[PDB]
Every structure is written in C-alpha cells, then in structure tokens.
Write a protein that binds this ligand. Structure first.
Ligand SMILES: *[C@@H]1O[C@H](CO)[C@@H](O[C@@H]2O[C@H](CO)[C@@H](O[C@@H]3O[C@H](CO[C@H]4O[C@H](CO[C@H]5O[C@H](CO)[C@@H](O)[C@H](O)[C@@H]5O)[C@@H](O)[C@H](O[C@H]5O[C@H](CO)[C@@H](O)[C@H](O)[C@@H]5O)[C@@H]4O)[C@@H](O)[C@H](O[C@H]4O[C@H](CO)[C@@H](O)[C@H](O)[C@@H]4O)[C@@H]3O)[C@H](O)[C@H]2NC(C)=O)[C@H](O)[C@H]1NC(C)=O
Ligand SMILES: *[C@@H]1O[C@H](CO)[C@@H](O[C@@H]2O[C@H](CO)[C@@H](O[C@@H]3O[C@H](CO[C@H]4O[C@H](CO[C@H]5O[C@H](CO)[C@@H](O)[C@H](O)[C@@H]5O)[C@@H](O)[C@H](O[C@H]5O[C@H](CO)[C@@H](O)[C@H](O)[C@@H]5O)[C@@H]4O)[C@@H](O)[C@H](O[C@H]4O[C@H](CO)[C@@H](O)[C@H](O)[C@@H]4O)[C@@H]3O)[C@H](O)[C@H]2NC(C)=O)[C@H](O)[C@H]1NC(C)=O
Ligand SMILES: *[C@@H]1O[C@H](CO)[C@@H](O[C@@H]2O[C@H](CO)[C@@H](O[C@@H]3O[C@H](CO[C@H]4O[C@H](CO)[C@@H](O)[C@H](O)[C@@H]4O)[C@@H](O)[C@H](O[C@H]4O[C@H](CO)[C@@H](O)[C@H](O)[C@@H]4O)[C@@H]3O)[C@H](O)[C@H]2NC(C)=O)[C@H](O)[C@H]1NC(C)=O
Ligand SMILES: *[C@@H]1O[C@H](CO)[C@@H](O)[C@H](O)[C@H]1NC(C)=O
Lengths: 224, 119, 217
C-alpha cells in the first residue's frame, strides 16, 4: 500500500525559490510516472508537471524554464525546485502516482495514488498570527443555542479549528476563509448545542496556525 | 503406463500494432525474471514486449493469449490423478504457477505462467 | 495544445434519480488498441481526488455499478443511475492520450436537492476583548437552510451598509443537505461607538418575508 506525503509548501516572496517533496511509503515508485498537479481554493485541477522512470521530464508552457523536477530512487522520493515564483503559482500542490512509464499502451489503470497536498503562497505579505475572539452565547435561543469563535486577521493559510480538542463534531460548521480587503484572512467556527448545557458544559475552540506557530485555546462562556 | 505431457506457456497480453501496411502482426507484452537455482531468494520482475503474427499466437477463450507451441515435458504414469500430483510438484519445484488445464484427448497439462523465470 | 470542456459546471439532483455529465475533447482520444484514454475522478469535501472511471467505460475497483461511463472519440458522458447523498462533490474528466502529459476538464459541482428549509438566524455583537484592540466585528449567522440562495443586508441605525461586510457559506452538509452562512460586518471601534442600533436583515425563499435581528450597543 503506497502513501504519498508532500511537504515544503510555505509562504515565499515573489521572485523567490522553493523546494517541494513527495515521499513514498510502502512501495517503490521507481518505475512509475510521477505527476505534480495544482488546485486553487480547493476547486479546479491543473496538471503542472511530470517525470518518468528514466528521468525524462515534462512541463506546461506557463512554467517551462522556471520549474525543474527531479527524483531520488534511493530515497523513493520526488522533488520540485521552483525559482522566480509569481503570484500565479500560488495554490495547493498534489503529487500523484501514475502508470509505469512507457507501458500505457498495454497496461493503464488510471491515476491511483494521490498525496495530501502542500500549500504554496506567493506574496510579499508578512506572516501574521490571528486574533481569536469569543462569539459568546447571547440572549440566540429557540430550544437550541448557538455559539462560536472568530479567527480574524491571519496570513497565510491554513488554520485548523477543533472544538474541545476534537471531541465535539456534531453541529459544527467551520466556514471557508475569506480574504479581507487588507490582504489578511478571517473565518469563523460555530456550533449549535442544547440550550440547557450552556451552564454545565465547557466549550473551548482550539485554533492552530503553524505558519505563525500560533496555538490558541479559547474559552467560550455566556456574556450576560 | 501412459505418457503425459506438460506444456508450460507464458501469458501474453497482445494488442493491435500502432500507427505505421501489414495488419496481421501483433504487439505483445509479458513478464520475465532471472534467478539462481541453489541460492534462491527470488528477484525483481522485469517486463518486456515483442511482435509476432496471428499464426504463432493462440488465445484462451477472457482474452489471454499464448504461443502455439510451448515448453513441453513428459512423464509416465498410470492415470491422470497421479500425473496431476507429479506435475504440480514439479511446477512448484521449478517455479511455475498459473492457469492449470488438462486436455485428456491429448494427455496434456497446459499451464499458462504469466511470467518467465530463468536460471 | 489540447483542451477538455466539461458541462454543466454544476447541477443539483433529487436523491434516487440519475445524473448525466458531459466531457468533450478537442481531439480524438482513441488509440490503436481501440481503447479511449479518458478518466473520471471525484473529489469529495475535505478529501483528495479518487479515481472513478478509467479508460472511458471501465469502473474502478470499489466503485458500485450505479456509475457508468459511455462515449467515444471526442465526446464522453458520465452517468450516475441513482444519486445518493454520498455522491456530492466535484467531478473531473481527464485525458491521458498525451501521457505523460495530462489535461483536466474544468470540473462539475454535484449538489444534492432536498426540501426547502428556512434558516435559523442569530446575531453576535463584538466582544469587549476585540473592542479593546480597536476593532468591532458583528456576525450574522444563517443556520441549516435550503436552498443556498439568500441575501443578507446590514443596517446600522437603519442606514443600509455596503462594502464593509463579507459572507462565507459552507458546503452542503453531506448528511442533512443544508447550508450554513456567515455575514461579518467589520467596523472600527470609534465607528462602532458612534451608532446604537445594529441589525442584519435576511431574505430567503423559505421565509414568508425578510427577518430582521438587531441589538442596541
Ligand atoms: C506482469 O506483472 C504485473 C504485476 O503483477 C501484472 O500487472 C497486473 O495486471 C493485471 C491484469 O493483467 C491487473 O489486474 C487489474 O487490476 C486493476 C487494478 O489495478 C490498480 O489497482 C491495483 C491494486 O493494487 C493495490 O492493492 C494491492 C492489494 O493490497 C496492494 O498490494 C497494492 O500496493 C495496491 O495498493 C494496483 O496494483 C495497480 O497498479 C498498476 O497500475 C498503476 C497505474 O497504471 C501503476 O502505478 C502500477 O505500477 C501498476 O502498473 C492499479 O493501480 C483492476 O481494475 C482490473 O480490473 C479489470 O480487469 C479485470 C480482469 O483483468 C476484470 O475482472 C475487472 O472487472 C476489471 O474489468 C484488473 O483486476 C493487476 O492490477 C496488475 N497489477 C500490477 C501490480 O500491475 C501484469 O498483468 C503481468 N503481466 C502478465 C502478462 O501477466
Ligand atoms: C508495441 O507496444 C510497445 C509498448 O510496450 C511500444 O513501445 C513503447 O511505445 C510507447 C508509445 O510510443 C513509448 O512511450 C513513449 O515514452 C516516451 C518516454 O520514453 C522513455 O521511457 C520509456 C519507458 O521507460 C522504460 O524503459 C527504460 C529503458 O529505456 C527504463 O529505464 C524505464 O524504467 C522503463 O522501464 C523508455 O522505453 C524510452 O526509451 C526511449 O529512449 C531510450 C534512450 O534513453 C531508447 O533506448 C529507447 O529505444 C526509446 O527510444 C524512454 O526512456 C514518452 O516521451 C512518449 O510520450 C511522448 O510522445 C508522445 C507522442 O505524442 C506525447 O504525446 C507525449 O506527451 C510525450 O511527449 C511515449 O509515452 C515507449 O517508450 C515505447 N517503448 C517501450 C515501452 O519500451 C511499441 O512502439 C509498440 N509497437 C507497435 C508496432 O505498436
Ligand atoms: C549455485 O551456487 C553457487 C555457489 O554455491 C553460485 O555461485 C554463486 O553465485 C552467486 C550469484 O552470482 C554469487 O553471489 C554473488 O557474489 C558477488 C560477489 O562475488 C564475489 O565474492 C564472493 C564471496 O567472497 C566470492 O565467492 C566470488 O567468487 C566473488 O569473488 C556479488 O556481487 C553478487 O551480488 C550482486 O549480484 C547479484 C546478482 O544477482 C545481485 O542480485 C545483487 O543484488 C548484487 O548486485 C552475488 O551476491 C556467489 O559469489 C557465487 N559463489 C561462488 C562460490 O562463486 C551459483 O550462482 C548458484 N547457481 C546459479 C544458477 O548461479
Ligand atoms: C485490430 O485490428 C483488427 C484487424 O487487423 C481488427 O479486427 C480489430 O477490430 C482491431 N482492434 C481495434 C481495437 O481496433
């Protein structure tokens, strides 16, 4: 059973360079075509590059001459060196295991194995940890009560939000991040709970934004 | 005792030739390896392709093709039940497993390998 | 180069009924072996893509027989005979004739239809903690509603707001088939303390008329 793990994605200045990695676990991918495909805003797919078993490489015209792909069969890994980056290169990058090179005319079974993806952000903006404010339950009723917490003014993505260290999942809505006019992101995480539990249950929203090394636990309690 | 045969064929995956006319030849892949008999241990399997004609190729009707004449090997036994044990043991000793089929009209055990071990 | 065009961009279907999606290539995908090199993939919310159909019409391992692919040459169609809630997500076709070079279609959004559900509206004022830092964010929440279309307007002292609010909507809940939406009005501390009455006004198909929530600072 193969598993792909991409890494190296981070915030980089325009014109800078960055090195992406695809680690294969559980099998050798030495004789397989390996592909790099990007996706913007978790929506849409664009094939970017590929490398064959013999080291032959293939690129789209928009990145030709600027991106270079390589692989290490002793390490069972693939790498993507990128230089003179532009804002058009921002996006999530997936590494995909393809068929064995050159044999597709006889054996083709589709693109079976995909990595988790690594996030690339091309911007001159600085890394900024978010401010987390409670969205406390209000005189928000109707048998069911709603409460939440607000993650405001952070950069770049991603932010992860759990509730009570992941113990609370039912009724949870974590909204997609929205880019503010300032260039910083913001999002909210909300949960609906029995109105009767507000006095007895502690509600803590757990935000992790590792790009800024921010780990925040927020207590959420009634206001008045 | 009767004399029984054991045809050891290799599974060929044939396809039409690409754009290139002689349109009765074929493009066909198969698997191959090479090992050492007394050390053993087994080794990585390489793939390979070649071209043949529709004559040398016979499919098993499923679309697995094979050669028309394979590596035969015979013995002398009483009935089919004994030559079964003997030949299966022989194939387990010499690294052959695959499509076992017994043609009684010719006393032949056709086994398709899908692999080609060598020593 | 080569181009792959999907249609439609999105569709909503009632569970149990079929769905049909079309992928058209600018060039023929049939090769000398008589197999068409066209695949169908699905990407569910929060997950990586996973193969559905390979080589035009062959179901991938683990895929139930409700899914079928047809077509040839330059026109291909993916059909789901009976849609279930678990099928919501994004569907992409992919050409592999140029292997190792590939081209994906634009993708098609598959949503699930259900009965109209009116939103549960809540309003949250800014916390004193945020007010300290010089900013005030007011949040208006629409919870578990369908369909997704809804208009939220902000009013400060009965003055309609524009340009100072942003909305975010969840993907359809793959279990109850509802949406949730947030509208955030962001003001400075001084501006927030200049006014008294704050309200969000919600218009939705499930409501007989717009619903207004408000509070006094
Ligand atoms: C020479 O040796 C090779 C290697 O053994 C052999 O290749 C096999 O060929 C047969 C058919 O000839 C294949 O059978 C088909 O398999 C299809 C599924 O293939 C995909 O899934 C495979 C599953 O493996 C996963 O699970 C195992 C089990 O736990 C796990 O170990 C693995 O690690 C993995 O997680 C996968 O291995 C396979 O990988 C191939 O393809 C990818 C992409 O091209 C490539 O990256 C790999 O390197 C490899 O080439 C692939 O991802 C299945 O859909 C298909 O079903 C259709 O056909 C059958 C009948 O053929 C119908 O019954 C069915 O209804 C469908 O119509 C079929 O079952 C088998 O998968 C191959 N295995 C490999 C490893 O390649 C060659 O055949 C040998 N040659 C000869 C002449 O014998
Ligand atoms: C019968 O069927 C066979 C199939 O088994 C077919 O032979 C193959 O046909 C396909 C399609 O034409 C060829 O696929 C092309 O591959 C191009 C890249 O090739 C590189 O990789 C190949 C696979 O690597 C294997 O072999 C190497 C050993 O060389 C090994 O290290 C690997 O690990 C792996 O095992 C390799 O064979 C190939 O070798 C070439 O170069 C070496 C010199 O380094 C030389 O020794 C060889 O003789 C050969 O010239 C090379 O290393 C790939 O770029 C190409 O796709 C491009 O062109 C298409 C055209 O439109 C574009 O669409 C695409 O975007 C790319 O730009 C194509 O995919 C395959 O290489 C053939 N050979 C094989 C598989 O061994 C026969 O032609 C068929 N015959 C008939 C009559 O039908
Ligand atoms: C029947 O049995 C005899 C031995 O009893 C085998 O002869 C042996 O053959 C193996 C395989 O060729 C040899 O093992 C190989 O040794 C290489 C180095 O050999 C030197 O060192 C040894 C030990 O000191 C000396 O005895 C020898 O004379 C040489 O001076 C290694 O480099 C080999 O590893 C590499 O090649 C193999 C090839 O498959 C790869 O798989 C490996 O990954 C690696 O790349 C290998 O280990 C062994 O040395 C031989 N013995 C003798 C006494 O010479 C016969 O081969 C065997 N039957 C058959 C059919 O071969
Ligand atoms: C391959 O060619 C033969 C004749 O040479 C023909 O009968 C067959 O239909 C062809 N196969 C495909 C897939 O076109």
């Amino acid at each position: 059973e193969v598993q792909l793990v991409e890494s190296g994605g981070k915030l980089v200045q325009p014109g800078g360079s960055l090195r992406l990695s695809c680690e294969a676990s559980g099998e050798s991918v030495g004789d397989n075509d390996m592909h790099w495909v990007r996706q913007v805003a978790g929506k849409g797919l664009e094939w970017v590059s590929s490398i064959g078993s013999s080291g032959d490489t293939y690129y789209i015209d928009a990145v030709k001459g600027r991106f270079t792909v390589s692989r290490d069969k002793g390490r069972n890994s693939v790498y993507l060196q990128m230089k003179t980056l532009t804002v058009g290169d921002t996006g999530v990058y997936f590494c995909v295991r393809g068929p064995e090179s050159g044999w597709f005319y006889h054996y083709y079974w589709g693109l079976g194995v995909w990595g988790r993806g690594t996030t690339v952000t091309v911007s001159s903006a600085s890394t900024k940890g978010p401010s987390v404010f409670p969205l406390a339950p209000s005189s928000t009723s109707g048998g069911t009560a709603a409460l939440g917490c607000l993650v405001k003014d952070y950069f770049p993505e991603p932010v992860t939000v759990s509730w009570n260290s992941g113990a609370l999942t039912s009724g949870v809505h974590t909204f997609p991040a929205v880019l503010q006019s300032s260039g910083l992101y913001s999002l909210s995480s909300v949960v609906t709970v029995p109105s009767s539990s507000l006095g007895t249950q502690t509600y803590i929203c757990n935000v992790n934004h590792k790009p800024s090394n921010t780990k925040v636990d927020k207590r959420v309690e009634p206001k008045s | 005792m009767t004399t029984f045969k054991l045809a050891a064929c290799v599974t060929l995956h044939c396809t039409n030739v690409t754009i290139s006319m002689r349109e009765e030849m074929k493009n066909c892949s198969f698997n191959t390896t090479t090992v050492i008999g007394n050390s053993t241990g087994r080794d990585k399997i390489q793939k390979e392709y070649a071209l043949f004609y529709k004559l040398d190729i016979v499919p098993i009707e499923n679309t697995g093709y094979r050669l028309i004449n394979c590596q035969t090997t015979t013995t002398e036994a009483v009935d089919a039940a004994t030559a079964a044990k003997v030949f299966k043991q022989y194939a387990n000793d010499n690294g052959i497993d695959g499509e076992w089929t017994y043609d009684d009209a010719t006393k032949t055990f056709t086994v398709t390998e899908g692999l080609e071990v060598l020593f | 180069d080569l181009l792959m065009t999907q249609s439609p961009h999105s569709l909503a279907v009632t569970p149990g009924e079929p769905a049909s999606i079309s992928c058209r290539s600018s060039q023929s995908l049939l090769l000398g072996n008589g197999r068409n090199y066209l695949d169908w993939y699905v990407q569910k919310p929060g997950q990586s893509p996973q193969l559905l159909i390979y080589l035009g019409s062959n179901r991938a391992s683990g895929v139930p027989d409700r899914f079928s692919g047809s077509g040839s040459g330059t026109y291909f169609t993916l059909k789901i005979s009976r849609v279930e809630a678990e099928d919501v997500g994004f569907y992409y076709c992919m050409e592999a004739r140029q292997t190792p070079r590939l081209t994906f279609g634009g993708g098609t959004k598959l949503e699930i239809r259900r009965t109209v559900a009116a939103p549960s509206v809540f309003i949250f004022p800014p916390s004193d903690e945020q007010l300290k830092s010089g900013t005030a964010s007011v949040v208006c929440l629409l919870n578990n509603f369908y369909p997704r279309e809804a208009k939220v307007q902000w009013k400060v002292d009965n003055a309609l707001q524009s340009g100072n609010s942003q909305e975010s909507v969840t993907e359809q809940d793959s279990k109850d088939s509802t949406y949730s939406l947030s509208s955030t009005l962001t003001l400075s501390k001084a501006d927030y303390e200049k006014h008294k009455v704050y309200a969000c006004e919600v218009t939705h198909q499930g409501l007989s008329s717009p619903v207004t929530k408000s509070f006094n600072r």
